[PDB]
Symmetry: D3
Subunit: 100 residues, 6 copies
Amino acid sequence: RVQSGKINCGDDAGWAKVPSDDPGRDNTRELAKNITFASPYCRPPVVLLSITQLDVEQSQNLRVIARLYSVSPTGFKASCYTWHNTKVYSMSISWISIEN
Amino acid sequence: RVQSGKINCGDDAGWAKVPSDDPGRDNTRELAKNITFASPYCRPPVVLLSITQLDVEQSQNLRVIARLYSVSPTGFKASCYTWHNTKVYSMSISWISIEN
Amino acid sequence: RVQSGKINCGDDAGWAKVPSDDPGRDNTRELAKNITFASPYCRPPVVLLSITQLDVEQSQNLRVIARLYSVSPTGFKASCYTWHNTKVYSMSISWISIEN
Amino acid sequence: RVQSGKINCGDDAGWAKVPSDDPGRDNTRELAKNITFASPYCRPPVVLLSITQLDVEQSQNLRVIARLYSVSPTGFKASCYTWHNTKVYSMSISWISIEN
Amino acid sequence: RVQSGKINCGDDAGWAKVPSDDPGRDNTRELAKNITFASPYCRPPVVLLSITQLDVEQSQNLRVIARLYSVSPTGFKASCYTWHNTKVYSMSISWISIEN
Amino acid sequence: RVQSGKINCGDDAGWAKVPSDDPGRDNTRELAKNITFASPYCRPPVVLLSITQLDVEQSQNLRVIARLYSVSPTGFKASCYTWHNTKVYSMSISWISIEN
Ligand SMILES: CC(=O)N[C@@H]1[C@@H](O[C@H]2O[C@H](CO)[C@H](O)[C@H](O)[C@H]2NC(C)=O)[C@@H](O)[C@@H](CO)O[C@H]1O
Ligand SMILES: CC(=O)N[C@@H]1[C@@H](O[C@H]2O[C@H](CO)[C@H](O)[C@H](O)[C@H]2NC(C)=O)[C@@H](O)[C@@H](CO)O[C@H]1O
Ligand SMILES: CC(=O)N[C@@H]1[C@@H](O[C@H]2O[C@H](CO)[C@H](O)[C@H](O)[C@H]2NC(C)=O)[C@@H](O)[C@@H](CO)O[C@H]1O
Ligand SMILES: CC(=O)N[C@@H]1[C@@H](O[C@H]2O[C@H](CO)[C@H](O)[C@H](O)[C@H]2NC(C)=O)[C@@H](O)[C@@H](CO)O[C@H]1O
Ligand SMILES: CC(=O)N[C@@H]1[C@@H](O[C@H]2O[C@H](CO)[C@H](O)[C@H](O)[C@H]2NC(C)=O)[C@@H](O)[C@@H](CO)O[C@H]1O
Ligand SMILES: CC(=O)N[C@@H]1[C@@H](O[C@H]2O[C@H](CO)[C@H](O)[C@H](O)[C@H]2NC(C)=O)[C@@H](O)[C@@H](CO)O[C@H]1O
Ligand SMILES: *[C@@H]1O[C@H](CO)[C@@H](O)[C@H](O)[C@H]1NC(C)=O
Ligand SMILES: *[C@@H]1O[C@H](CO)[C@@H](O)[C@H](O)[C@H]1NC(C)=O
Ligand SMILES: *[C@@H]1O[C@H](CO)[C@@H](O)[C@H](O)[C@H]1NC(C)=O
Ligand SMILES: *[C@@H]1O[C@H](CO)[C@@H](O)[C@H](O)[C@H]1NC(C)=O
Ligand SMILES: *[C@@H]1O[C@H](CO)[C@@H](O)[C@H](O)[C@H]1NC(C)=O
Ligand SMILES: *[C@@H]1O[C@H](CO)[C@@H](O)[C@H](O)[C@H]1NC(C)=O
């Protein structure tokens, strides 16, 4: 089975401050959603992430990641991620999950 | 079967004005292509969209969507989408279609 | 089998100057990696590219491509690609490869 | 999808006389069932037949066929088939259907 | 994944007497093996049975079944089965297991 | 891909004498065909054999095998096989080949 979805992170005011894991980045924020597959897999599927909606402040550098932390048979943790003075007004991440 | 392609939307001068479906957005334009699978499916495939070419005006906010309206067994309607004063000089959307 | 990976291109100082293949573009640079599938295919798989990390200079236009040159049963050549005065500080391309 | 089933033809007293299509065979009888897949295919699946229950008269030659006439996306016509003076007391045909 | 194997039941002297579950059959014997898939499934696969070696006494009726009791994600119970005065000197059952 | 076919061995007069590989069998004959897949595989497929047509002399013991020697990506050697005084007038072996 193959499943797909869409993660609307929205404004980064609702995103949480998280502690940087890259020493050259600070003020790292992150909308980290925790997804559950409608129809579970029993072996962890391969997941691809895609950014398909961006609304970023022009006066300041575009800093975004569509981050993919982990993948289990039941679901996956992924996030919209930005850092420093960059301002995200909108970020969506559509994704896919395939067996093997 | 799995099929893939690429939608080159180009300059947004050729994109059409379309009526906003989000009340906080205006001047919504859209290059909405209508794709047909080379080898048809008989059940609608799962489609993922990806943005893989961006050329956007720096003086004004990055506003883009790789929108996916609908998916049939024969094809799918999807679009490059921008709004307000944002200026897109170039947007490509490469995509994939898998069975299930 | 389905395989996935991630290409971190990094700063465009390490990207090479390459000769433009589009007459309206100049100063075309490119981090062109050459990937090898862990478990080979015997027929060329369908590959999708996705941009999942961008860090671009705000004072100058966003110009990027996640380019996909060729796909063999053994691997594929793809690249982060920018042109003119645009400055990329960071670009990642996560990808997927499926049979057929 | 893959589907399987089982056709119990039973005693050949209930099998019909049918006209021989092989000139070296006569008294050709046949229990010809007409199967319908639970979950339809949209392209005709590959079907394999197997004989998995035989109960044949010892005094006379073993003459049986697990015949596979046709395969559609909706189902298939197949039959237990015997000829001449052979006496079948019992014949089952378990089968399988796979996509492609 | 698809797995296959082969069950050599051998002479029916080693087959066990089992109590008939069909009132018109007696002296029912059965070589009932209990198979384990090399690489487990997590949903029960579709299994087909095939008889591919028979060595039966000519003086007495051919009575055999390639019986398929149950199928789990881990394996399946199946058997060579004969009844009454029939004498099996040799019966093999080759089988296949496919996902879905 | 999945492929299927059918091997009609016919009368055992055309079958060759071959040297027994089982010390308890003699006068071993064999119609050993050498099959080639229409659309090659690049890894050896799993093959199942099935006997689906038998026409055997009643006065003498039923001795048959649907033998499967080897499987390559290009095809497979399999055979109708009988031994001792058994007389086969007709044996067909329908088969299937699936990827993995
Ligand atoms: C190019 C550069 O290093 N500019 C610094 C700026 O660094 C921040 O922005 C750059 C690229 O725009 C990278 O994203 C860095 O990761 C990021 N650093 C941090 C700690 O977030 C800052 O150092 C800024 C404030 O000192 O000075 C700029 O000139
Ligand atoms: C942050 C904000 O609301 N700025 C407004 C601007 O809103 C437009 O741009 C923002 C983010 O850049 C969103 O994309 C909105 O969807 C968009 N609104 C519309 C109607 O297109 C405009 O309201 C602008 C003109 O009044 O004022 C800015 O300050
Ligand atoms: C909109 C435009 O053509 N501006 C030109 C600029 O063209 C460059 O940037 C645009 C969009 O930002 C395209 O990406 C072009 O491909 C790119 N051209 C080249 C040759 O790289 C330059 O021509 C610039 C210098 O003459 O003038 C701008 O006004
Ligand atoms: C060996 C033979 O031809 N015996 C014939 C018998 O033929 C019948 O049985 C054989 C094998 O057992 C084949 O199955 C033939 O297809 C079948 N023929 C028919 C018409 O059904 C009969 O011809 C029989 C009656 O004349 O004579 C036997 O000796
Ligand atoms: C044709 C028939 O019923 N013959 C009976 C025989 O029945 C046995 O064999 C037949 C077919 O060969 C079926 O397999 C039956 O299932 C089987 N019955 C049993 C109880 O095993 C016996 O009844 C036999 C002894 O009374 O008489 C034959 O004539
Ligand atoms: C039951 C038995 O061993 N009978 C023998 C017979 O053996 C042949 O037939 C049996 C079963 O019907 C097996 O198929 C053996 O494999 C087969 N042996 C050979 C060498 O082909 C013969 O030994 C026969 C001639 O001596 O005597 C029977 O009683
Ligand atoms: C979902 O995300 C949170 C935030 O990181 C994490 O701590 C939690 O364990 C996750 N929940 C699940 C379903 O695993
Ligand atoms: C393709 O797109 C247009 C524009 O929205 C739509 O109206 C039309 O029905 C579509 N054509 C097909 C092939 O369905
Ligand atoms: C990898 O990329 C380089 C740069 O274009 C190319 O010339 C080379 O042939 C490629 N190597 C492989 C493994 O094909
Ligand atoms: C089923 O079998 C009969 C007997 O041959 C045939 O005539 C009929 O058309 C079949 N029905 C279907 C469902 O096609
Ligand atoms: C295998 O077969 C025996 C005999 O019927 C059965 O009782 C036993 O539970 C089976 N073992 C497994 C692995 O389930
Ligand atoms: C086919 O069968 C013959 C007989 O055993 C064998 O010797 C030969 O090598 C086979 N041919 C192919 C195509 O491998």
